[PDB]
Amino acid sequence: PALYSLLFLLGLLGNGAVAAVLLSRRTALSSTDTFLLHLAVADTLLVLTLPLWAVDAAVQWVFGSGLCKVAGALFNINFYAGALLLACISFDRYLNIVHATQLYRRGPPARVTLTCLAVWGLCLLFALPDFIFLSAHHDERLNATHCQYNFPQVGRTALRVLQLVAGFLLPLLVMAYCYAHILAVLLVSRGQRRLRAMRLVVVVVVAFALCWTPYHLVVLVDILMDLGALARNCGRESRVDVAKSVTSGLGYMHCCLNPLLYAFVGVKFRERMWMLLLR
Amino acid sequence: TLSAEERAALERSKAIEKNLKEDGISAAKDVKLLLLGADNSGKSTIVKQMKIITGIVETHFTFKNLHFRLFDVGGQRSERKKWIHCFEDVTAIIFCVDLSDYNRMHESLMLFDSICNNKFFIDTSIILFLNKKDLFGEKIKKSPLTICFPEYTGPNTYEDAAAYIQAQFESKNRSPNKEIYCHMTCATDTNNAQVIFDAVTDIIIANNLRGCGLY
Amino acid sequence: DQLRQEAEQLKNQIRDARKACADATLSQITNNIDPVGRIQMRTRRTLRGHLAKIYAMHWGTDSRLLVSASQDGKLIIWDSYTTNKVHAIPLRSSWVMTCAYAPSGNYVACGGLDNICSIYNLKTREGNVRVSRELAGHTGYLSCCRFLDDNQIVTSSGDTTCALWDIETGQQTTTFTGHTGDVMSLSLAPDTRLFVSGACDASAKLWDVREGMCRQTFTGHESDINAICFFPNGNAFATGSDDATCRLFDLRADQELMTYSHDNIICGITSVSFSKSGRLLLAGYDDFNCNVWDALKADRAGVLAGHDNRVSCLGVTDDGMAVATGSWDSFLKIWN
Amino acid sequence: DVQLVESGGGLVQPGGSRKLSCSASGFAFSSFGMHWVRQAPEKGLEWVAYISSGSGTIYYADTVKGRFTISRDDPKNTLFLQMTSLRSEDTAMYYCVRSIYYYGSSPFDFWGQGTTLTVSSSDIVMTQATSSVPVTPGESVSISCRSSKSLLHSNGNTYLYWFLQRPGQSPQLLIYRMSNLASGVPDRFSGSGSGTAFTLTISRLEAEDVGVYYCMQHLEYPLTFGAGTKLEL
Amino acid sequence: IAQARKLVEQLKMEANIDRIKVSKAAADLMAYCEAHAKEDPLLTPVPASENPF
Ligand SMILES: CC1(C)[C@H]2CC=C(C[N+](C)(C)Cc3ccc(-c4ccccc4I)cc3)[C@@H]1C2
């Protein structure tokens, strides 16, 4: 539990400072700055539920069905927001580094609120089912009390496939394409800044892949088990649950790391933070 | 805004705001480059597509879906410190040097050192042009490159001499994050706009890396 | 050869006589005057619409209309009360470092690196602003402009020389010489018979507009003087320098009365202005701030924290009801 | 010089339609709002329609709403009025006027020459008590007109305009808000008032001051005129 | 040889001025900023009803 709480403190402190710094500007914010602020807000909201998940995985759910609905809606909204916002950040970097000549502007701040609002609305519409269907169930397999869906097994499979294909595959493909082309362009440029750019891009891609692939891999394993492609047994189910727990821990670790891997490495953000602290 | 005439005044203000915004859009695809160097340095004949337009001279040739504006500040005969900040936001500085004017080499070096280390130009990249190669090759044979640079120790061949000249000019940087795109051009060199464009392309990409948080 | 000795001894006589007058420092007479307290002023208006950096600004004599010059090649006339854009004038050259508003309000002036002072007539029968005259003759950039009448304007350039023009004819009536460096500012006396100019030779001098003669010269700044302004009663003025200090000079005493330095200030002053009474001295620095100085005691009475870039211009309405400041962030802010 | 010339008037049968054209020449037509004002035979001025700069705002008098429509052709510097169904009450001389609105402007300075139209066979009320006022040159004169609402506003500006029409000519602007002298008029004219009572006073009356004086309110649409006061020599 | 000729002449004019004690000159500045002290909106806040902003 100490590591859980330690994860909680760092995540709140990291994201909160990032959100505070960007909100302390008196002028327009760069497109990537806006996306970073939205990602920080979403991740803060998502990590606000960490003790809830820790308690539920520890003993059981004891907070009732209403809190299930509220927490599930919050979590799904912020999860999809984080995924889509990372994809949008990668696309923005691609457009600003691969087509930099064709998108050159003489210092007008291009507004990007449309995409942010669209992403948030799509997240809310995706999370809609949580408000209605998530509840508390008394299982007969584990003799415990967890928060789960009450959809038919076919509905569960459909929802799991939707999660897999709309939270992992599309963001992963978009990020891969964008960052690979960014690397290709940078390696054929001339300057003393391309080295750190390539290193940071590779680090970000590796972090995302190695922090998100495990959880969705476990989800795919469960989908296959529920589709008849795999056999159900006590040992396999126990291993699946252990993998769920460990992968969720890794995901929360990625969420707490996100401020470091996207904001604190940029010179612009560091100067902003120092100026704000001076004031 | 309640009054009838105060309502018409508010309409007029909005019509002005709309025109200001449109003018900003139409003047967004323009790259501003500052021209510097001594006299007779070829700073008036870099790109043969001039289309010009005492004081400040501007040139606004266009090339590859981009509008380039070249500002010449010759003839001011004042202290640069008090008008140099007007160009703080230029994309890059184009510097011209004449390789056939030994007596003017020292003035050019003094100019380059002051500009390269100006507090305002701590981030603006420089495009160094070393013009008039043909004369340099003809003059070096008669006059060795020792009078202008007494510390020169290498051979008296064109390839080595030029590299030393470029090395000295590049030696005044004394700072990171600022690169110098040195190039050698002759009188009959049509491809000078190409050199500026690709160098600006790298300058723009580097700036975006800073804005996009990748640096 | 001998004149050089004569030049040196004449300077000594000036200094020796200058030292005789000084009996008690300004800070030593006004020590028992109660302070002014913390001057808390909050933004009331924010005029936005300028794209590039703003380099100059002037108040209309009616204390309601404004004019501002920006590097984007626009000259905008603002209605302060409502924040409405009365006019927007396109400029031939986008390099503009000054602008002035005529006392009558019929004309407005502009200039910069082009070495030409352009005068625009606002009250035209055709309903659009037109350039009435273009004044030429300066061999360097134009630093300041100030109207004397509807047909007379004073200019200063980096040529080290000021001038007085006759807008009707367009020729140069009088030329003022004596500076050994760029002239960066001037302020017209309230009675418009004398004016002062701050130059890069670290000196300011007082000129007789009618006689074309240098009546006095004031020294003390360690660097160039960036701005200058007359005291409201016309018997003193204040100068701002890259030295990171402001100083108060008296014409009758012919010396420096007080300095406005603080250990925490390192940058140079870009603008200087007084209040209607003359007790507050507002100056704009490069640290993105303006400090209000109790001109009688040289104490920081307040700070106008705002803007995201250097503050380039200052202004106070003839009625003293507001303060306007422009910056390189392309925003004008009115304070009260 | 500034010049507004109108054409398209004449004799039309009742229930027909005509178009009036007002072609400007000599100013920035694109920046000026334009009005239509008509004056039926020896009756008095009456505001008709208004089209703003950029055509954003359009207003009509209640009398002509639905029948008339006003359009502006900026590139060609022309102002139009399309009249669809003309009653016998529309016969009048239609005037083309220009108005520019910004802080401290004179929004009715120049009037067109007018075109005659003949047809075969809530609001603020402004009153001019006296219809005629005999006087001789060199004598001070005073003309007053009241109003229903107080033309004073929160701005402190009293929105009242004084126009003088000479025999056979179009009206001319004299005082544009309550006391401001229109450019070009002699300084002998003066204006004053408070709230709902106003007066225009002339000193050292000349031989060219004979005509009819109209007082108009620009506080809110529809613009309304006075009956008019005539000076007789 | 001639450029400095006028330089000395200017100094002679500038050296012959009937100056006054700084004590008097300083006092006059103090008096002015006090007499016109009630008419300065910035120095003393003006009631919000009379403030155009
Ligand atoms: C949270 C609840 C209280 C309600 C919603 C779902 C719950 C369980 N579940 C589904 C395990 C949460 C979950 C989901 C996804 C991740 C994750 C994976 C990879 C990368 C980043 C992340 I974040 C982590 C945890 C508990 C009931």
Side-chain angles (χ1 to χ4, degrees):
Chain A
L3 68 101
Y4 291 73
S5 180
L6 173 56
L7 257 169
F8 188 71
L9 296 145
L10 302 205
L12 267 293
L13 265 72
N15 291 258
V18 169
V21 167
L22 297 166
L23 288 173
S24 301
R25 284 288 289 116
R26 332 176 185 248
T27 82
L29 264 192
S30 171
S31 313
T32 298
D33 292 2
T34 312
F35 288 118
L36 179 56
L37 170 53
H38 274 114
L39 175 64
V41 162
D43 286 303
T44 313
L45 289 190
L46 188 52
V47 299
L48 259 170
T49 74
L50 197 166
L52 302 202
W53 168 77
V55 167
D56 172 286
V59 176
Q60 73 200 303
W61 192 260
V62 295
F63 314 133
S65 46
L67 198 142
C68 270
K69 288 138 199 174
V70 175
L74 252 176
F75 196 106
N76 258 29
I77 296 159
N78 299 122
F79 192 1
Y80 284 53
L84 298 172
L85 283 186
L86 294 174
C88 284
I89 287 171
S90 300
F91 192 64
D92 185 53
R93 306 230 179 112
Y94 167 75
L95 279 179
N96 269 351
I97 296 162
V98 167
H99 293 293
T101 295
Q102 311 182 5
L103 305 184
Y104 183 53
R105 318 211 64 174
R106 184 60 187 102
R111 306 297 294 110
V112 76
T113 288
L114 175 78
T115 77
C116 289
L117 293 206
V119 160
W120 276 106
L122 184 81
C123 294
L124 257 169
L125 299 213
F126 268 127
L128 250 169
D130 298 7
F131 284 117
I132 301 136
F133 303 102
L134 216 62
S135 171
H137 170 63
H138 188 69
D139 268 306
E140 226 286 309
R141 186 188 70 190
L142 315 179
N143 205 356
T145 309
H146 299 307
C147 203
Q148 63 154 80
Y149 296 75
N150 52 86
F151 271 110
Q153 169 171 356
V154 170
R156 233 178 210 172
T157 300
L159 216 79
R160 300 250 192 256
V161 169
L162 179 95
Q163 292 173 336
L164 179 69
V165 183
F168 183 58
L169 286 176
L170 168 137
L172 185 76
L173 293 171
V174 167
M175 285 212 225
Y177 184 59
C178 296
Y179 280 139
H181 265 240
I182 283 171
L183 252 60
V185 163
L186 263 41
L187 286 149
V188 196
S189 78
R190 193 223 309 265
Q192 304 279 75
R193 293 171 157 177
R194 63 222 283 287
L195 278 289
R196 258 173 62 135
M198 300 171 206
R199 285 186 165 184
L200 258 174
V201 167
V202 170
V203 160
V204 166
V205 170
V206 164
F208 181 86
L210 293 202
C211 277
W212 277 44
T213 312
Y215 172 93
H216 295 285
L217 179 68
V218 172
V219 161
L220 191 82
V221 163
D222 192 58
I223 284 179
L224 295 155
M225 275 181 97
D226 301 0
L227 283 170
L230 294 170
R232 281 180 168 113
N233 55 87
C234 323
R236 211 98 91 75
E237 177 180 294
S238 304
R239 287 144 86 242
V240 166
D241 206 52
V242 175
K244 275 273 191 53
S245 306
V246 179
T247 47
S248 289
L250 251 63
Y252 269 79
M253 214 160 88
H254 179 199
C255 182
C256 85
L257 287 190
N258 227 351
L260 173 136
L261 273 170
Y262 264 96
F264 275 55
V265 314
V267 168
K268 157 178 288 199
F269 180 94
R270 255 171 297 119
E271 283 206 304
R272 279 196 213 302
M273 176 178 215
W274 286 134
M275 268 203 300
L276 170 57
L277 295 211
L278 287 165
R279 231 172 292 163
Chain B
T1 167
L2 299 174
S3 185
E5 254 190 82
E6 212 148 55
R7 276 211 296 284
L10 172 54
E11 258 189 289
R12 181 170 147 99
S13 172
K14 290 187 303 216
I16 287 155
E17 288 175 1
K18 191 205 155 175
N19 251 32
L20 296 182
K21 198 174 176 168
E22 168 165 305
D23 279 2
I25 297 303
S26 175
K29 222 76 166 208
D30 50 357
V31 170
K32 282 197 274 285
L33 308 164
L34 175 54
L35 255 167
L36 277 165
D39 315 295
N40 286 343
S41 202
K43 66 187 293 197
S44 56
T45 66
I46 309 104
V47 308
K48 291 213 146 47
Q49 328 174 20
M50 284 164 206
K51 301 124 194 205
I52 174 165
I53 210 168
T54 303
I56 185 172
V57 195
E58 183 179 327
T59 314
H60 59 62
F61 87 93
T62 173
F63 180 89
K64 280 275 187 60
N65 187 69
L66 220 63
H67 198 227
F68 285 121
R69 281 152 63 107
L70 313 173
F71 301 116
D72 188 0
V73 285
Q76 218 78 58
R77 312 285 76 97
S78 298
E79 181 52 30
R80 299 161 291 166
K81 296 189 289 125
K82 289 304 194 319
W83 57 256
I84 208 75
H85 59 72
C86 288
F87 303 95
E88 150 166 304
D89 47 358
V90 299
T91 293
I93 319 301
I94 293 163
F95 205 104
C96 265
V97 183
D98 187 350
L99 261 49
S100 71
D101 281 346
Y102 296 6
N103 54 1
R104 304 259 269 282
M105 191 70 58
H106 274 303
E107 276 166 48
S108 294
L109 263 155
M110 293 287 103
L111 197 43
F112 198 95
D113 190 357
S114 187
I115 299 291
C116 211
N117 291 302
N118 216 82
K119 85 186 91 71
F120 295 116
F121 300 150
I122 196 64
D123 286 4
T124 50
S125 309
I126 291 159
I127 297 156
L128 184 70
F129 276 105
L130 307 168
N131 301 351
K132 295 178 199 156
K133 305 127 67 174
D134 62 355
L135 309 196
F136 184 59
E138 194 79 297
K139 187 64 63 173
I140 183 159
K141 289 290 105 201
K142 318 303 169 203
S143 48
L145 186 75
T146 182
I147 58 186
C148 174
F149 283 97
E151 291 81 354
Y152 185 42
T153 306
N156 196 2
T157 185
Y158 167 86
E159 270 68 17
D160 287 324
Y164 188 67
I165 294 276
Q166 154 168 345
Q168 294 290 74
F169 274 106
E170 275 217 51
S171 68
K172 299 295 194 286
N173 190 354
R174 195 165 64 244
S175 177
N177 319 340
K178 190 211 303 304
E179 218 217 339
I180 295 159
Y181 304 87
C182 184
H183 195 237
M184 321 164 58
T185 56
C186 177
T188 68
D189 264 32
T190 305
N191 55 294
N192 264 12
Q194 179 60 57
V195 176
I196 297 148
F197 170 75
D198 60 44
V200 165
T201 309
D202 284 302
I203 292 160
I204 289 160
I205 290 166
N207 281 119
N208 293 358
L209 276 161
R210 179 168 146 68
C212 295
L214 278 183
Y215 172 66
Chain C
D1 45 298
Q2 167 267 308
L3 52 98
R4 303 288 154 69
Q5 161 53 237
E6 200 183 7
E8 201 70 358
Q9 60 89 359
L10 273 170
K11 295 310 304 173
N12 269 236
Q13 276 136 33
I14 282 163
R15 171 176 157 69
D16 194 63
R18 213 171 281 216
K19 184 64 69 64
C21 295
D23 311 307
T25 42
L26 175 61
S27 211
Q28 167 162 49
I29 279 165
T30 190
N31 192 1
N32 61 1
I33 296 304
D34 47 4
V36 299
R38 210 76 198 170
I39 297 292
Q40 191 81 54
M41 289 164 32
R42 193 187 74 77
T43 307
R44 310 293 181 165
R45 310 286 165 184
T46 304
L47 316 165
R48 61 199 91 214
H50 266 313
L51 259 57
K53 306 143 70 184
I54 292 156
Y55 267 115
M57 164 269 294
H58 209 243
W59 273 107
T61 195
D62 84 329
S63 162
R64 172 149 183 182
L65 292 169
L66 247 178
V67 66
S68 82
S70 178
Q71 235 189 356
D72 62 62
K74 290 280 170 196
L75 202 74
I76 291 170
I77 295 173
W78 306 83
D79 181 6
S80 179
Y81 286 15
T82 83
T83 68
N84 280 129
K85 297 176 182 55
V86 188
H87 293 285
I89 309 147
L91 303 176
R92 290 189 76 235
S93 90
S94 298
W95 314 109
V96 54
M97 324 206 318
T98 189
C99 74
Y101 214 148
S104 61
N106 303 308
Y107 298 91
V108 84
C110 212
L113 291 180
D114 44 289
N115 304 346
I116 289 158
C117 191
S118 294
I119 296 170
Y120 309 84
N121 177 14
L122 297 179
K123 318 293 188 62
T124 56
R125 190 75 190 174
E126 289 91 7
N128 55 27
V129 171
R130 289 195 284 89
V131 199
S132 89
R133 296 297 289 227
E134 279 188 344
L135 307 175
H138 278 315
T139 64
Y141 62 91
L142 206 77
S143 316
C144 216
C145 294
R146 283 295 172 266
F147 274 99
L148 279 158
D149 306 304
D150 271 1
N151 198 47
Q152 250 177 2
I153 181 161
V154 200
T155 70
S156 93
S157 266
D159 290 352
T160 78
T161 168
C162 307
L164 173 66
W165 303 78
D166 190 295
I167 300 162
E168 175 60 73
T169 71
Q171 307 304 341
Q172 210 172 178
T173 291
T174 310
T175 321
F176 309 95
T177 52
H179 273 308
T180 59
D182 294 7
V183 193
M184 293 298 297
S185 56
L186 70 92
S187 84
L188 271 168
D191 49 291
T192 44
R193 292 215 295 180
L194 307 169
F195 73 110
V196 294
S197 94
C200 281
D201 74 330
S203 80
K205 34 192 71 173
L206 181 82
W207 264 300
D208 191 301
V209 70
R210 176 185 296 107
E211 301 278 2
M213 150 189 84
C214 185
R215 204 175 198 95
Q216 297 195 44
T217 195
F218 303 94
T219 61
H221 271 289
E222 304 295 353
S223 190
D224 47 274
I225 297 172
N226 272 2
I228 194 152
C229 200
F230 254 110
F231 197 71
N233 90 323
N235 281 322
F237 61 92
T239 74
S241 169
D242 277 8
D243 187 18
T245 73
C246 290
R247 294 171 197 265
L248 189 89
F249 301 91
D250 198 302
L251 312 199
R252 286 181 289 162
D254 192 0
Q255 327 172 203
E256 181 209 358
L257 289 179
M258 181 156 290
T259 317
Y260 300 112
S261 64
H262 191 64
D263 274 298
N264 199 18
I265 306 281
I266 314 295
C267 48
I269 301 103
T270 310
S271 315
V272 155
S273 199
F274 269 98
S275 65
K276 217 218 174 190
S277 174
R279 178 109 188 208
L280 308 182
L281 166 52
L282 299 99
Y285 302 73
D286 294 349
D287 65 0
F288 314 162
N289 285 353
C290 320
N291 296 8
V292 180
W293 298 89
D294 177 68
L296 248 64
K297 305 180 82 73
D299 284 354
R300 299 176 54 168
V303 167
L304 312 191
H307 301 287
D308 196 60
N309 213 348
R310 172 187 314 227
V311 182
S312 38
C313 35
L314 263 199
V316 181
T317 60
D318 263 349
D319 56 4
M321 209 77 68
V323 187
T325 83
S327 287
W328 286 0
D329 62 355
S330 76
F331 290 126
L332 292 97
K333 284 194 181 185
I334 308 198
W335 312 74
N336 201 164
Chain D
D1 255 5
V2 182
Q3 183 175 352
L4 290 157
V5 60
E6 307 109 345
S7 61
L11 203 141
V12 67
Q13 298 293 316
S17 179
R18 292 273 286 196
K19 191 166 205 182
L20 302 186
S21 272
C22 163
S23 38
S25 301
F27 63 102
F29 179 92
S30 299
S31 209
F32 279 80
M34 302 292 296
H35 303 258
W36 280 101
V37 180
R38 86 182 160 194
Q39 161 164 352
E42 65 267 8
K43 226 187 276 174
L45 300 168
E46 177 178 355
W47 175 77
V48 164
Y50 157 74
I51 182 148
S52 202
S53 76
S55 310
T57 295
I58 312 177
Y59 295 124
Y60 306 82
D62 300 307
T63 311
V64 306
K65 211 172 280 169
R67 311 196 282 108
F68 288 10
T69 176
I70 191 180
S71 54
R72 182 214 278 272
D73 183 5
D74 276 304
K76 202 73 176 67
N77 274 208
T78 314
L79 185 88
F80 296 114
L81 184 81
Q82 180 74 241
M83 305 180 286
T84 55
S85 62
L86 277 77
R87 300 123 164 68
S88 57
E89 207 71 38
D90 309 77
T91 178
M93 179 105 78
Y94 287 75
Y95 290 109
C96 193
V97 195
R98 90 183 168 136
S99 75
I100 191 160
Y101 300 102
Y102 57 86
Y103 175 80
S105 55
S106 166
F108 267 80
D109 41 357
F110 198 72
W111 289 53
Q113 60 146 20
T115 171
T116 305
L117 171 63
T118 310
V119 176
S120 181
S121 281
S122 45
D123 304 0
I124 296 174
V125 183
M126 297 212 74
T127 83
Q128 299 208 58
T130 183
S131 157
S132 181
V133 178
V135 66
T136 45
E139 311 283 332
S140 293
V141 187
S142 169
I143 310 174
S144 66
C145 90
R146 307 258 199 258
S147 80
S148 295
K149 303 176 61 167
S150 62
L151 295 178
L152 180 66
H153 201 259
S154 309
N155 310 346
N157 285 316
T158 301
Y159 288 103
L160 184 129
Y161 294 63
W162 283 100
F163 306 98
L164 155 63
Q165 180 168 19
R166 288 181 186 88
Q169 308 180 12
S170 48
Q172 191 203 347
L173 175 75
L174 302 182
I175 308 284
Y176 36 97
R177 267 173 200 78
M178 200 187 69
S179 51
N180 309 114
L181 278 167
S183 163
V185 317
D187 52 354
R188 62 165 153 280
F189 293 87
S190 172
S192 78
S194 184
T196 53
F198 322 90
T199 178
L200 172 87
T201 176
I202 306 168
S203 299
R204 287 89 55 69
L205 188 135
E206 227 171 1
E208 58 89 8
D209 298 354
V210 304
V212 187
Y213 289 67
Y214 300 90
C215 87
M216 180 196 89
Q217 66 92 9
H218 202 315
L219 181 66
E220 195 182 358
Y221 297 85
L223 314 188
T224 49
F225 289 74
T229 294
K230 173 147 60 164
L231 296 198
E232 292 288 359
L233 170 50
Chain E
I1 188 68
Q3 181 271 353
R5 201 284 316 166
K6 65 186 185 297
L7 174 58
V8 290
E9 215 293 329
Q10 264 191 299
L11 296 177
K12 258 157 60 179
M13 277 186 167
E14 295 186 3
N16 197 7
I17 298 290
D18 47 344
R19 312 195 164 70
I20 56 155
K21 307 303 214 169
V22 306
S23 175
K24 175 171 176 186
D28 277 49
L29 266 70
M30 192 218 309
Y32 177 94
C33 95
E34 181 269 6
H36 305 66
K38 317 265 283 307
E39 326 177 321
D40 202 358
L42 296 178
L43 194 59
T44 66
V46 74
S49 53
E50 321 292 358
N51 180 5
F53 304 93

